[PDB]
mmCIF file of C-alpha atoms and ligand atoms in Angstrom:
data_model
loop_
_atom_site.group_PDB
_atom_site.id
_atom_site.type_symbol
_atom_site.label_atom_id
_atom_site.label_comp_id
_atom_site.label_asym_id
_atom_site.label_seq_id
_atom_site.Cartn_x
_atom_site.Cartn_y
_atom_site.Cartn_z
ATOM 1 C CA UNK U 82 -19.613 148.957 31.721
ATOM 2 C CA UNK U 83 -20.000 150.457 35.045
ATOM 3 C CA UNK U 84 -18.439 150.956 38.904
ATOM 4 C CA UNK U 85 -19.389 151.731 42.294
ATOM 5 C CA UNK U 86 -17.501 154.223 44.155
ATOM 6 C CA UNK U 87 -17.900 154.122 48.125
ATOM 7 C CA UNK U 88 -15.074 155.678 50.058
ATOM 8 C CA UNK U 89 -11.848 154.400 49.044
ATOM 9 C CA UNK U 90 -13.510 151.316 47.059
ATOM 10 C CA UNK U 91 -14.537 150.803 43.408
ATOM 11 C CA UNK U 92 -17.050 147.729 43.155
ATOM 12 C CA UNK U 93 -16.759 146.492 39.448
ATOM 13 C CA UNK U 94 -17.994 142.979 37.387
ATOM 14 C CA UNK U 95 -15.127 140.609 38.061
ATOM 15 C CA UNK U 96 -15.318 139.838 34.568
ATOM 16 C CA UNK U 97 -14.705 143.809 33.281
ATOM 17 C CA UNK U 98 -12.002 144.044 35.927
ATOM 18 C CA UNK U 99 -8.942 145.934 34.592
ATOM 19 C CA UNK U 100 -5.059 145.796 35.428
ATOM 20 C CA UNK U 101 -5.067 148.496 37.896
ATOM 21 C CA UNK U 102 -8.330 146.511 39.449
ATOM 22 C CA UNK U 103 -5.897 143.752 40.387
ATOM 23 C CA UNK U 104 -2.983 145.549 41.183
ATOM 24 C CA UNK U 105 -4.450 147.267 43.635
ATOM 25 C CA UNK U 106 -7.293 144.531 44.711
ATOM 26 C CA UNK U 107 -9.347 144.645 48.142
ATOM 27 C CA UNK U 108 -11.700 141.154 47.582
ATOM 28 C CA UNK U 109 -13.112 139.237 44.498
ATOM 29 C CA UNK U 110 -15.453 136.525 44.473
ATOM 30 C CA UNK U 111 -15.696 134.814 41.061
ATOM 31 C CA UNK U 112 -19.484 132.935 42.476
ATOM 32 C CA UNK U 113 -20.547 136.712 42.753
ATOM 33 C CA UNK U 114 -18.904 138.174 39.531
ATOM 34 C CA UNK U 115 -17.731 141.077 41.738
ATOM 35 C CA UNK U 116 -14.388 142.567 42.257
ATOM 36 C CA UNK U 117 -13.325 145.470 44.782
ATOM 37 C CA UNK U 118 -10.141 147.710 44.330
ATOM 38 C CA UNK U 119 -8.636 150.635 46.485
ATOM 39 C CA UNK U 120 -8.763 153.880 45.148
ATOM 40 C CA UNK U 121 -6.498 157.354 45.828
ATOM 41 C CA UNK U 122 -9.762 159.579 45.614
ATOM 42 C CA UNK U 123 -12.993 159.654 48.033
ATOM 43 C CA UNK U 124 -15.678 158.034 46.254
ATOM 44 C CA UNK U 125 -19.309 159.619 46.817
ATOM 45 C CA UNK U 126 -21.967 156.591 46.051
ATOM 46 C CA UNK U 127 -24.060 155.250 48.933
ATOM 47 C CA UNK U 128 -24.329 151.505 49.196
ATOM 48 C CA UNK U 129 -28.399 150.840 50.299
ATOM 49 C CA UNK U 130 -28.515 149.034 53.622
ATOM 50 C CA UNK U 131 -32.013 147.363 53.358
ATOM 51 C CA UNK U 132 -34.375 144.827 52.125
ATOM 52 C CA UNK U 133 -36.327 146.780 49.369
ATOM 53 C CA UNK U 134 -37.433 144.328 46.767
ATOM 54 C CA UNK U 135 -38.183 147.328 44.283
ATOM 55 C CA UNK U 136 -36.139 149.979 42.631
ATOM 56 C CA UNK U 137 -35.004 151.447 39.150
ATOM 57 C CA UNK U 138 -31.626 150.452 37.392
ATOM 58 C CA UNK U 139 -29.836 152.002 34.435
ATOM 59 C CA UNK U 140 -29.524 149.976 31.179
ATOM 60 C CA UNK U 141 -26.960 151.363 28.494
ATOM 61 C CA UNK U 142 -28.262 149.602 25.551
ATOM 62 C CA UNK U 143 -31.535 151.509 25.929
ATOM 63 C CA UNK U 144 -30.400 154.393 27.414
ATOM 64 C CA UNK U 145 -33.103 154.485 30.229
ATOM 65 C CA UNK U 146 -33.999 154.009 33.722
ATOM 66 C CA UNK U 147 -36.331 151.279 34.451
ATOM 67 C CA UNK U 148 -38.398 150.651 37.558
ATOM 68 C CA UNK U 149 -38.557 147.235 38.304
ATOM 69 C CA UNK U 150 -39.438 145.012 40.831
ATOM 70 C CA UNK U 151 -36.191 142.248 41.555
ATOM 71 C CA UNK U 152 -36.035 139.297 43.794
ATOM 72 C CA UNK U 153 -34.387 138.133 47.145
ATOM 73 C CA UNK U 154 -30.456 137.801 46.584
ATOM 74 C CA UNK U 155 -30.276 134.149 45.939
ATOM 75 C CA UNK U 156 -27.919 130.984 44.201
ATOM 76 C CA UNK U 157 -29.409 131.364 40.303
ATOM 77 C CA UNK U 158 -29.116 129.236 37.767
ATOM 78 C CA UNK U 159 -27.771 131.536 34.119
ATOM 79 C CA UNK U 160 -27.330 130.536 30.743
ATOM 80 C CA UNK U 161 -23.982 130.618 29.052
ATOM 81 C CA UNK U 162 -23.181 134.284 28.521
ATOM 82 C CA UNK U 163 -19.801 135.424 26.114
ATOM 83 C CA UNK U 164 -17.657 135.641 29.946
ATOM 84 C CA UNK U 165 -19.083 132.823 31.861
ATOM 85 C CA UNK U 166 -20.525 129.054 30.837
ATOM 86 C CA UNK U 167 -24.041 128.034 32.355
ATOM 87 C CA UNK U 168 -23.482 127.855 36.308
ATOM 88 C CA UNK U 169 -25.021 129.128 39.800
ATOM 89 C CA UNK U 170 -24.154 132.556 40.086
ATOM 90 C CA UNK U 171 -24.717 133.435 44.094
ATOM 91 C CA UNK U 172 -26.152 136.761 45.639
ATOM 92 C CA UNK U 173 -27.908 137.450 42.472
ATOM 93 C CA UNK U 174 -31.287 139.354 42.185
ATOM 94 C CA UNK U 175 -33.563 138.864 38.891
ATOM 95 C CA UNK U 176 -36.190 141.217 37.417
ATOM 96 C CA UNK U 177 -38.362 141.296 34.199
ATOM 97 C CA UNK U 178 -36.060 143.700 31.661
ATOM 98 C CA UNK U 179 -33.662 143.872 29.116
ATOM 99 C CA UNK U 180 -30.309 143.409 29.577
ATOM 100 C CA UNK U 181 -27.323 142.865 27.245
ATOM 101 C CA UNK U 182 -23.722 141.751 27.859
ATOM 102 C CA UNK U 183 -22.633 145.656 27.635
ATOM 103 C CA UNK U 184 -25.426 146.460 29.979
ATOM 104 C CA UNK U 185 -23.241 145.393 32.773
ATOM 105 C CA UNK U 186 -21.838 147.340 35.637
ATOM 106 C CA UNK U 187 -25.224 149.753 35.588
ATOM 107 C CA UNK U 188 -26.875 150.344 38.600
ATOM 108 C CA UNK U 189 -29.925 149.372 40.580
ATOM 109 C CA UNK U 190 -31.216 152.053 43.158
ATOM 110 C CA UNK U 191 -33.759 152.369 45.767
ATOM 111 C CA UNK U 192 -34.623 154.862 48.417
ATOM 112 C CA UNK U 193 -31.802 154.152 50.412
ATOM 113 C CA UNK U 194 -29.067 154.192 48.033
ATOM 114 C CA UNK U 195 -26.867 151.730 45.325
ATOM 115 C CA UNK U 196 -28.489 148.223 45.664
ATOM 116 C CA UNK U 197 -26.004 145.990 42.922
ATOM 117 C CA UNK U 198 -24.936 146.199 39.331
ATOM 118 C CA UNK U 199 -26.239 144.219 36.621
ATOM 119 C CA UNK U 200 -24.196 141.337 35.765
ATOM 120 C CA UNK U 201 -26.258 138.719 33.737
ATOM 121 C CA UNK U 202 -28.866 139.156 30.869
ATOM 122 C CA UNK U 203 -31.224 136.827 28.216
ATOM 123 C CA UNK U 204 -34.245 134.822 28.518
ATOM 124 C CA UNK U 205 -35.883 138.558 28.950
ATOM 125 C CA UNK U 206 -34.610 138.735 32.419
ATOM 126 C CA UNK U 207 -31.770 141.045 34.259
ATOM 127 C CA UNK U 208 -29.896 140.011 36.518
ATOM 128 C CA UNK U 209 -28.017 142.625 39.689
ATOM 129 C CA UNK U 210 -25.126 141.375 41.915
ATOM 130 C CA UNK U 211 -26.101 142.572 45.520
ATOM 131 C CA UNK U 212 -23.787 144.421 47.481
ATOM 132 C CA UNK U 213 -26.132 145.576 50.517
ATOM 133 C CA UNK U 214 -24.620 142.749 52.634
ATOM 134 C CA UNK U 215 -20.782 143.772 52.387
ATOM 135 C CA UNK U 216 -20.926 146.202 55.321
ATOM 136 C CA UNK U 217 -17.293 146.603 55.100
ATOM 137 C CA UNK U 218 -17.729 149.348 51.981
ATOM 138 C CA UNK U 219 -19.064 151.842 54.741
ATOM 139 C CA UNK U 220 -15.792 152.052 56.793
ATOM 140 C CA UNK U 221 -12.290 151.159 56.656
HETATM 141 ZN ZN1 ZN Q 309 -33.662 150.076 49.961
#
């Protein structure tokens, strides 16, 4: 589990959202497993505007950080997980790490702030769902 907060948005896994998540929806896009909902309270996350290829993301089911090195948001191929069956998942970033179906929702950070959340694990691979290129979080 795991959000995003950034102004009046929380960025979740489509696949975790909750009730209130869709009652009070902003955009979704199932390709991306992400979901955005309003909030009543000022969020105080950064979203990273960047192209940093390196960074450190939080994984639950070790209770660590890891620095990693993750790849250019891209159209990957993942195995059938327990919320989704094989398929191209878009905007996705990979890196060398462990990462469980719980896992999701933590995030990856660089210098400049929030980069994505995890959202697909196995094979010994993570897997983040970028959200530097949805400017709109910043305003609005
Ligand atoms: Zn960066």
């Amino acid at each position: 589990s795991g959000a995003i907060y950034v102004g009046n948005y929380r960025v979740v896994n489509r696949h975790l959202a909750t009730h209130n998540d869709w009652a009070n929806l902003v955009w979704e896009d199932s390709s991306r497993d992400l979901l955005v909902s309003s909030t009543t309270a000022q969020g105080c996350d950064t979203i990273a505007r960047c192209d940093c290829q390196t960074g450190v993301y939080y994984c639950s089911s070790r209770r660590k950080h890891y620095p990693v090195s993750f790849s250019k948001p891209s159209l990957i191929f993942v195995e059938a997980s327990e919320y989704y069956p094989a398929r191209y998942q878009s905007h996705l970033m990979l890196a060398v790490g462990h990462s469980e179906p719980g896992d999701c929702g933590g995030i990856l950070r660089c210098q400049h702030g929030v980069v994505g959340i995890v959202s697909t694990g196995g094979n010994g691979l993570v897997g983040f769902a970028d959200v530097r290129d949805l400017l709109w979080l910043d305003e609005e």
